[PDB]
Design a protein around this ligand. Sequence first.
Ligand SMILES: [Br-]
Ligand SMILES: [Br-]
Ligand SMILES: [Cl-]
Ligand code: NA
Lengths: 310, 39
Amino acid sequence: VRTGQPVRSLPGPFVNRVCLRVDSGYRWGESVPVAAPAYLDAAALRNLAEAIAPTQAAQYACIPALIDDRTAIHPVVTTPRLLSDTVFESPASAVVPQVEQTFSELGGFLARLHSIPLERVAALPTRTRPAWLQAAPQAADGIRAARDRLDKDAAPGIQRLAGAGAAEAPEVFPRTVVHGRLSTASCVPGPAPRVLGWREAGIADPMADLAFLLRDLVQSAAAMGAQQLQEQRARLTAEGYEAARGTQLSDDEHTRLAGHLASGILQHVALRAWSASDPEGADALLRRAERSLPGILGAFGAPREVTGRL
Amino acid sequence: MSEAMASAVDEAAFADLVSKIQAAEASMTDEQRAVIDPA
Ligand SMILES: [Br-]
Ligand SMILES: [Br-]
Ligand SMILES: [Cl-]
Ligand code: NA
């Protein structure tokens, strides 16, 4: 627990993360297993920081420097806690209002991030798929194969949202800066919340950032059962995003959001089936996500046009 | 990779990241510290 020593380790399929206690606070580092151009280099991270710096998103953005092509080090934060510690908490503990308010602040932060003009971010790549899948095309194909082997009757509403439903939205809409990996494990909770990561950032659909954040609410509702708490967090996120932007999400935006969220759930369960040779456990996860998703999308404000697909 | 191999890889990758962050923290100068951690 001493200064200079690791207090948290978060391994993952695509990125390893460590929180080192230091004299001035808590220092997050991340490594990726391959040096790949899909991950933002030093110049792209600088360009993005420069674009964020004069905006109201600056306070939240904890953008790292690179030690090497595979290794990032973040500005110090004041706690080793992560929003995911609350979202996936089991058993329940007392609701901390300032932690819950992080969701409204994140929605506002994302609205501001998504308003940065593309001309200010010339170094950022168009994200046609997540950075981690572009860096590892063999993993992408394997996950896609495992996803194809999922029982199509396990989650028919999720399948509709990810497939036919997603395709109904127009393809022409403003692409924006996206964080690209906005899971609750990349957020330091409020007061004064901070957003970590950034090497997956680029230019893509802003709805994909909101979907990625909502996926943790669906997964935790399904796995731990605090459905009402997760629904309230979803509602707060939408409230903050719409208030900051000044306009409600359109039906098309909700269709795209639900498609990214449903696809993300399928990717998550397919990864469990393929990473851990567990087709039957992934099926159980998928059936629970099918039951948890409608309430979360409803709380987020999705219309019957979306929620009609189940 | 077997389970023993996967665990060996994960242990090595984690320790290497810890060592890199420790090295960077130890050696960063006040001017580099000023750019990454502003007040
Ligand atoms: Br930077
Ligand atoms: Br994915
Ligand atoms: Cl899930
Ligand atoms: Na419509």
